[PDB]
Structures are given as structure tokens and as C-alpha cells.
Symmetry: C2
Subunit: 374 residues, 2 copies
């Protein structure tokens, strides 16, 4: 019903009865939207990474199932109140099979499943479908609200630390894409960057390329260009040299799964960034909504790390040429996430609840408490 | 075979290392302008290969000009040789090999007889240029033996029979005359049946690792695993890596090492994970004239290396007035982070307890 202030592109285009997803693989050269009509469409979109970013995955999954179930209710494939309920639970389990590392998808759909059980199966199929639609629409609006909070908490905290020192403007180093493309609206870590920019307090955001999928070079740069946000693109390996030679106020990254102790699963390279950040005395912040927090996982070693097709590294995602030689004694290691241990999150964890600073020593973070906050 | 430098008396051909692994193209070097451009465009690259091809390139071009009467006298050849060494040195600044080699060649040209025939003065330089090729071969033969012996012994102390090596960029036969430096060590470990795996960083933006190092390992059946640069920290935590073995472009008096961008990042992580780091380079990569890393000129290159698909010349990054690209192609690894040692043809020099960890002048003066 409302356009975002600050530039659409939004990766998720929703209107009652219709879901369209921006193909984030084709940016920045091409702007393509694909219709999501079935549960199979949304599963594929997540798996192929047409839609990506932890929150965007969860929100589009809820909306995708809602539009598809509403469709099946209208045409005749469904059926009955009970079997709409049955289809919704079955669709939630199936969509959850797409990508394992980011918890947002699991937190959202499991919470939706519990609410689906609470629904009345006696209702006239379409009534049960519309009830789920409203629940799915709620997770979109909630994420918008979560990001509005993150931006404020993040920018104010970083600016207070800046003015405690002798600095009026901040330089931020980031990785991957955590803007409007990775979320419903504004973003998380890039949301903080946006707020600092609007206040006239951002000197520069430094963006890591983020191999092999290039979320930084392709998506983050794109977002900064559309809004005239001062941005500098670097190669992932140049991060250490950057922090030594130039003053970086904070490393602000996103998250896919934050464990109970604080251990953060995020895009591959984030751990590398955290190790270097500690070496150079640059405080590291993790920005994520509380739906990215995971009480069910105790520590980082219990997180399933997604590995993807070796063609992401060996082939051009554009010219389709195999840019790497092939042989029987060659292997490709392609994990698309790593773990940043809570020890290396020196700045704090930024949610919509506020900014949670680490403890002096062991269990640096209590994630259950952050979720329990008002 | 898979050599980047193809030399035979009167002819120099250079493999276009930009086009590998998809294409194998050799270009004739006929003029001093050809060799300057080859280095600048990075058709030939890698510190030692740059210096060797520069000497051979000047030698071939001059011999050709002395043959067809383009250079009439012996002093005309002498003047051309001295000025050509200065001109080629203007190509790429960071790697010292080019400068050490050509400055050493200039002093030898100065003591040549200018009254002699044009062909006679040119042939004298040819033999000097041929010498720098053979010397580099000999340097690398030493490096691979010293490095492999030290690393294997270090692993045997921890109770391991085979080693896992993590590297960056390309330091094999493509980057040198023969065998290589850091990948030379990897080769020697592989031949002895003592290498479990070499892990190769992609090495953005030019992709020396993904394109050249992988290629070399494939041609020789060397067990290899390609990773993205950012995955290096996760690799070292999750898997046992015995040593990080890297090359060099300029090694300062105190030990500070200029090497391909990302090497410093690798060194920082190596210290965090307790993985000893080795720098493998010939003594012609050592630099007494530079005291420390802050006095090294770091080459920055065209932003299209990052923003465009590498020939095809198509942009893959959005463009705007408030976007800039930071493209340094080297960084400094301080001597503190070289925990394993510096591997030369002289041997493996371990770091001192404190202070300046290395004495480069002492290494050069060894037998």
C-alpha cells in the first residue's frame, strides 16, 4: 500500500493476490521480476538465490506460501478448511528444505506452523487461506519495523562512540549485502549506514566484494549508487591493508544465525574480517533482527554451514566460460558461510530491542534475554 | 612445459598470462617497447619472470638492431643498452627484481669496450642476459630443497607425515624461469610423496591463484584445493594447515615483505590460528636499499580490474559519481608476522627473538 522512502528497488513486490521477486542474480546489469504462483516457485527462488539475504528469504517464503495457497483455494485445488491447514503445514516443511544456515526461514515458518494449528479447520478453505495471508503480511511489516529500530540504535551508538573520541564523521567497513535487497525495507547493517548518511554523519562506507557470489560488488554498490551514498569497493583480501592504512571507526556486518552464546553465522569472509578487526583495534558490530537470533542452537559448532556448487567459483556467472582449469586432482571448497565467535564481536549485537554490548568475559551474549526484552 | 618465457638465441616469446587457462598464446618480443608493454599489461608477471624477460627482451631487441645495421657502432649499442634498462625499469615499481637485475646489468655494460663492432657489444649483453635466466633456475632449485626439508621436519615434530600448504597468488613456473619459489617448495614436497594438499587462494582481482596456480597443479596432478580469499580464516580454524608459504616482490632490510594484495591479511590470520608463515624468494628479491615496509612504493592499478569482466571489458559493477575503487595490487607483511622464516637459495632463515627479526644484508652475503 506504500512505497518506501528512499529508492525502490525492493527485492519483494507484494500486493494482495500477487508476489513478484527481483532476480538478484542479474543485478546490476538487469532488472527482472518473476511471478511467484506456486510453492515450487518460492522454493526454487530461495534455492537458486533469486531471492537472498536471511530476512528476505523468510518474508518471501511466508508471502510465497500465502499467495500460492490463496491461489489453490480460488481455482479449486483446495478444497476444504482442514486440507488448506494440512497444505500450509506441508508447504512450510518443504520450503524449509531450501537453504539451511539462515535461521530466519526456520523461525518464521515454524512460528507460522504453530499459528496454523490454532486456526479453525471448520472454516471455508478460502477463509483459512485469507487468515494465513494476514499472518504472512504481518511478518513483512514486522521486519520493516525491526529494521527501523536497528538503524536508530546502530547509528546512535556508533555516533556516541565517535563523539567520545575526536571524530565527527564515521568510516564503516562492511561485507555482503544487508540493505533493502536483503530485507523487506532499509536493511540491517546497511540500514545503520543509511541512517548515518541521512544524519550527515557518514564519511564513507567501504564494501568488500564478497566472493564468489559478489553480494558486495553487485548489490551493495548498486544500493549506494541509487541513493548517492559515498561508497568504496575493495577486494576481500585488501581488508587488512585498509584497516592499517586508513581509520575505520567500525566494522558493521549482518547475520544469518546468532547462537545463544552470541556465535554468529554470516557470509563467508566475515570471520576473516573479525580476526583482522581485532588485530587492528576496530570494533565489530553484528546487526540483525531478533528473528535472526536462535535459542535452539548453543554455539557456532552446532550450525550447519551451507556449501554450494563449485561453479560459483569456477565459472563466470555472466560469460558462462569456465575461468578455472579442470583436473582429476583439483577440488573446490565453497562454504558460503563461516562462524564469527562471540569473542570477536567486540562492539555489540544490534537488534530492534537496542544495542547489546558484550560481557567482560565468557558467555559474552545472552540471546534468550534479548528475545525476552520488550 | 607450461613455461612463460620461451627463449632461443635471437628470439624471445612470452606467454600471455592474461589469457590462461582458456587460451595459450605466445607473442614475439622484437623491440624494447614490446617488453615494456608486456610487463605493464601483465602479459608477463611474477617478480622473477619480470626481471628475466626484461633482460632477455632488451638483449634480443638490441641484437636484432645490431644485425640489420640499425645500431651502427659499438657505442651506439652501449648507449641503447643503458637507456633501454632505464626505460624498462619505468614499467612496474613494487617488485625489486626488475631493478636489482637491470641496475646490475647497467654497471656491466659500462665496462664494455665501445670501439668494438656493434654485433660484438650486443652479444656480450646477450650472454649476461642468458646468465640471469640460468641463475634464477639455480636459485629456485635451491629454494625448493631448503623449504621442503624445513617444513617437513617442522611437521614431523608435531607428529605428521604429510603436509597441508596454504598459498596465495602464483609463484610457480609461470612466475619464474623454472619450478618457482613458494610453489617450487610445494612441487618438491609433492615429488617426495610428502604433500597432502596445496590450498590456493583465488587472489582477486587478477586471479593469479584461480587461473594460473590451479592450472599448474592440474598439469602436474598436484592435489589442489581452490578457495575464495575470504575463506582463508575459516579454513585454518576448521582444518589443519601445516604452513602458509607465500612468494615475495620486495623484501626489506628488516624483513618487511611486499607481496600480492591479501598476503598481509593471510599473515594476520596465520598468527591468530598458530600457523607458521614462510616467505619464499630468491636473493634477487631482497632489497638492502629499502629499510622497512613503509618505504616501499605500492603499485595501484586500473579500477577496471575490479569493475569489469577481464577482457570482454564488460562492467559487472554499477557506476556513480560518489563511488571509488581502491585497487592496490600489493601489501606489506611486517617481519613480525613472518613466523616460519625467509626461504632463499641460501637456506631457511629463521626469525630472531625480537628487534629486527631479519638481517637481509647477511643473507645476501652468504655462499
Amino acid at each position: 500500500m506504500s512505497k518506501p522512502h528512499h529508492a525502490t528497488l525492493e527485492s519483494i513486490k507484494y500486493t494482495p493476490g500477487s508476489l513478484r521477486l527481483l532476480d538478484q542474480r542479474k543485478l546490476p546489469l538487469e532488472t527482472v521480476f518473476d511471478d511467484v504462483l506456486t510453492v515450487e516457485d518460492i522454493w526454487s527462488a530461495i534455492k537458486e538465490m533469486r531471492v537472498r539475504g536471511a530476512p528476505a528469504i523468510a518474508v518471501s517464503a511466508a508471502l510465497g506460501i500465502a499467495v500460492a495457497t490463496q491461489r489453490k483455494a480460488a481455482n479449486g485445488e483446495l478444497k476444504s478448511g482442514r486440507e488448506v491447514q494440512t497444505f500450509l503445514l506441508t508447504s512450510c516443511d518443504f520450503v524449509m528444505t531450501s537453504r539451511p544456515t539462515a535461521v530466519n526461514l526456520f523461525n518464521c515458518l515454524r512460528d507460522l506452523k504453530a499459528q496454523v494449528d490454532k486456526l479453525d479447520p471448520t472454516k471455508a478453505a478460502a477463509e483459512v487461506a485469507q487468515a494465513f495471508v494476514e499472518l504472512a503480511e504481518a511478518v513483512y511489516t514486522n521486519d520493516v519495523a525491526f529494521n527501523e529500530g536497528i538503524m536508530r540504535h546502530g547509528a546512535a551508538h556508533i555516533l556516541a562512540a565517535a563523539k567520545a573520541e575526536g571524530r565527527d564523521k564515521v568510516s564503516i567497513l562492511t561485507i555482503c549485502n544487508t540493505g533493502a535487497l536483503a530485507t523487506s525495507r532499509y536493511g540491517t547493517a546497511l540500514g545503520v549506514v543509511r541512517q548515518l548518511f541521512y544524519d550527515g554523519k557518514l564519511e564513507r562506507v567501504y564494501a568488500c566484494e564478497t566472493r564468489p557470489w559478489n553480494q558486495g560488488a553487485r548489490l551493495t554498490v548498486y544500493e549506494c549508487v541509487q541513493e548517492d551514498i559515498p561508497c568504496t569497493l575493495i577486494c576481500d583480501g585488501a581488508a587488512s591493508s585498509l584497516m592499517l592504512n586508513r581509520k575505520i571507526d567500525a566494522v558493521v556486518v549482518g547475520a544469518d544465525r546468532i547462537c545463544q552464546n552470541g556465535d554468529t553465522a554470516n557470509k563467508i569472509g566475515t570471520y576473516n574480517l573479525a580476526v583482522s578487526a581485532k588485530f587492528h583495534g576496530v570494533k565489530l558490530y553484528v546487526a540483525a533482527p531478533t528473528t535472526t537470533l536462535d535459542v535452539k542452537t548453543a554455539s557456532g559448532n552446532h550450525v550447519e554451514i551451507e556449501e554450494r556448487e563449485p561453479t560459483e567459483i569456477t565459472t563466470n556467472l555472466v560469460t558462462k566460460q569456465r575461468v578455472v582449469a579442470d583436473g582429476p586432482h583439483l577440488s573446490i571448497w565453497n562454504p558460503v558461510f563461516d562462524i564469527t565467535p562471540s569473542e570477536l564481536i567486540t562492539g555489540g549485537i544490534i537488534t530492534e530491542k537496542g544495542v547489546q554490548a558484550p560481557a567482560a568475559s565468557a558467555p559474552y551474549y545472552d540471546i534468550a534475554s534479548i528475545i525476552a526484552q520488550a
